[PDB]
UniProtKB/Swiss-Prot annotation, chains A, B:
Member of the two-component regulatory system PhoP/PhoR involved in the regulation of alkaline phosphatase genes phoA and phoB and of phosphodiesterase. It comes from the Bacteria. Keywords: Activator, Cytoplasm, DNA-binding, Phosphate transport, Phosphoprotein, Transcription, Transcription regulation, Transport, Two-component regulatory system. One of its GO terms (cellular component) is cytosol. This is Alkaline phosphatase synthesis transcriptional regulatory protein PhoP. The chain holds residues 1 to 121 of 240 of the full protein. Phosphorylated by PhoR. The modification 4-aspartylphosphate is found at residue 53. It is found in: Cytoplasm. Residues 4-118 form the Response regulatory domain. It comes from Bacillus subtilis (strain 168). The lineage of its organism: Bacteria, Bacillati, Bacillota, Bacilli, Bacillales.
Length: 121, 121
């Protein structure tokens, strides 16, 4: 069976892009548009990987990771950052992030990053 | 004057190997051990060719290429990949990579690849 990816971004266009391309690549995809929804879906649907926007409404990406860590939950996490919004990757490691991708990104870039992370496990 | 090669790998032994052999072959060599250092050296020292490890700390090889491309910078780039970590060369072309070499590699292989790339320019 297909691996399941939870895609989380508040920009609808980014979610649509990610879902289309990852489904084409043979993954099952579920989505969230805010951090509260994301945390609930992670806890319940147990995705194999989470693609998570850093700047998110309700609970931001840092907070989502922090709450997962507090629950002792470990997910492969690809963090998405905006142009010229540098992220502290040492903090990211504290939070359980596994990799980072900046926006904009191409279909092949995201496919490559997700594949590499899924292989590392 | 000698052509200048920027060699970037987080394994010290690989950097030492590359520097020794390329200097012997008549190149000037500068080095970096993470992607942040690599990007800074590329932007500042303007090497004639970059030998770049795909799996790099701070900024990985994809990210280094992506940032160079965003700055409109064009460098001849030889990407280094690990054993059984296949890389998407169509993505590589998007990123400006010119050639690929797997690890482990011999002194003559790297000398040949660098020579061919420098000739293509
Ligand atoms: Mn956002
Ligand atoms: Mn490496
Ligand atoms: Na929803
Ligand atoms: Na993780
Ligand atoms: Na250094
Ligand atoms: Na290039």
């Amino acid at each position: 069976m297909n691996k399941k990816i939870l895609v989380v971004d508040d920009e609808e266009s980014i979610v649509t892009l990610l879902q289309y391309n990852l489904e084409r690549s043979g993954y099952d995809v579920i989505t969230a548009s805010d951090g509260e929804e994301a945390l609930k879906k992670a806890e319940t649907e147990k995705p194999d990987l989470i693609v998570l926007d850093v700047m998110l409404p309700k609970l931001d990406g840092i907070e989502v990771c922090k709450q997962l860590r507090q629950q002792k939950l470990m997910f492969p996490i690809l963090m998405l950052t905006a142009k010229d919004e540098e992220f502290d990757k040492v903090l990211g490691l504290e939070l359980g992030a596994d990799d980072y991708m900046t926006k904009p990104f191409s279909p092949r870039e995201v496919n490559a990053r997700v594949k590499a992370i899924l292989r590392r496990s």
